[PDB]
């Protein structure tokens, strides 16, 4: 049929499309304001909400009618989203074009490779997931310099939108699970089977993981935007604080592959719980390390490592608990937690800071959420593997 590393390249393409989506708004704040900063950020808020919710229908549709159709619809929708975002005049115009259309298309791109790629790597599920999610830490390294080039803004929307449409159409074009029979390899039994979606959705462990995903995502999104202002409040220059926090991008991208590889070799739960614990420690430690370039860098690298790991390790966990046949539907549901979090978290962090005027409230709230997540992730072990009596009774 085809070499099983191609779905990795596909997930990389799709997720890199998605990372470009996530990166664009940051470069658009100054150009758009040139023609309120909060008023712009509402478009990114809608983008995060629509993306995170639409993974759910994208996952159900991928499981029902295959991932090719969904990734390609998402590519057309996101391409239209960006290209129409270029021909805008109002704020509501941007909300619609970028927040809704683009978020819809991007979510439909994002989910199906995460579900599909591991099916090709039953030997390396987490690493395959990682390739399907690693593009989201690559948007900067590809788009950023060229973005600055073309700005020095409508052109960035139009041209990047075309490029993303093409990458998503290619990534979806060649994307599909392995054929039903053969799995890519190199007295009566007791036949088990993967969980159905209705069975997993009704499982309590699913909702404990859901809660842990919400906590981790919410903490990261509530503080990440504040790291550099923490540094400037401690006496650093804007440029020095900014340099320091920028290392976070490197660690956020690398963790998606590295954690996947690591938990493939040794297992998920304790490493994942360790990453959560370390994130909790970082939310507290910033008050001691955050006032110097080297210290603020260490905190940024740790936070990024932990945060990014979430997006390989939650699907890897979900895959371990319930199996791969319904991974589109199960992970589509579960990601809606990061959907709600990306909607509301950044706003909450800003509001707590303003309320007290200080970074104690958001950082300690985020440390509490990561503590809850540590407990949930560490104590939650996989559920009973299901018994397939309706197949078991075929053996004479
Ligand atoms: C934003 C953080 C909130 C995460 C936790 C949300 C709990 C929502 C309730 O879940 C319910 O649990 C039952 C079994 O436990 C299921 O049978 C039922 O179908 C499901 O609706
Ligand atoms: C900054 C912290 C980095 C993570 C270091 C913790 C690695 C955990 C290794 O323990 C292993 O975990 C597996 C279960 O998941 C099992 O094989 C077994 O219980 C144990 O051998
Ligand atoms: C002195 C004021 C209180 C400080 C310590 C408690 C912080 C309570 C803020 O609530 C926040 O609201 C979000 C709403 O979605 C939830 O995610 C979550 O429960 C929590 O992060
Ligand atoms: O990895 C993701 O998919 C993500 C989702 C929502 C917000 C930020 C990110 S970085
Ligand atoms: Hg957002
Ligand atoms: Hg988005
Ligand atoms: Hg976290
Ligand atoms: Hg999210
Ligand atoms: Hg708090
Ligand atoms: Hg909190
Ligand atoms: Hg809460």
Residue numbers in the entry: 7 to 41, 45 to 161, 167 to 200, 211 to 420
Structure paper excerpt:
We have identified a transporter from Syntrophobacter fumaroxidans (SfMCT) that shares 25 and 27% amino acid sequence identity, and 51 and 57% sequence similarity with the human SLC16 family L-lactate transporters MCT1 and MCT4. In summary, we reported two structures of the bacterial SLC16 homologue SfMCT in complex with the monocarboxylates TSA and L-lactate. We have presented the structures of an L-lactate transporter (SfMCT) with two different bound ligands. Both structures show SfMCT in the pharmacologically relevant outward-open conformation, which is an essential prerequisite for the design of L-lactate transport inhibitors using SfMCT structure-based homology models of human MCT1 and MCT4.
The structure of SfMCT was solved at 2.54 Å resolution by single-wavelength dispersion (SAD) phasing from thiomersal-derivatized crystals. The structure shows SfMCT in an outward-open conformation with a central, conical cavity open to the periplasmic side while the cytoplasmic side of SfMCT is closed. With an average inhibition constant (Ki) of 120 μM, SfMCT has a higher affinity for TSA than for its transported substrate L-lactate (Km = 233 μM). In contrast to L-lactate, TSA is not transported by SfMCT as determined by a micro pH electrode-based transport assay. The carboxylate group of TSA interacts with the hydroxyl group of Y119 (TM4) and the Nη nitrogen atoms of the guanidinium group of R280 (TM8). L145 (TM5) and F335 (TM10) form an ~8 Å wide confinement that accommodates and orients the carboxylate group of TSA for proper binding to Y119 (TM4) and R280 (TM8). The thiol group of TSA is in hydrogen bonding distance to the hydroxyl group of Y331 (TM10) and 3.5 Å from the isobutyl group of L28 (TM1). These two residues trap TSA by partly obstructing the ligand-binding site. The side chains of F359 (TM11) and C362 (TM11) are within a distance of <4 Å from the benzene ring of TSA interacting via hydrophobic interactions.
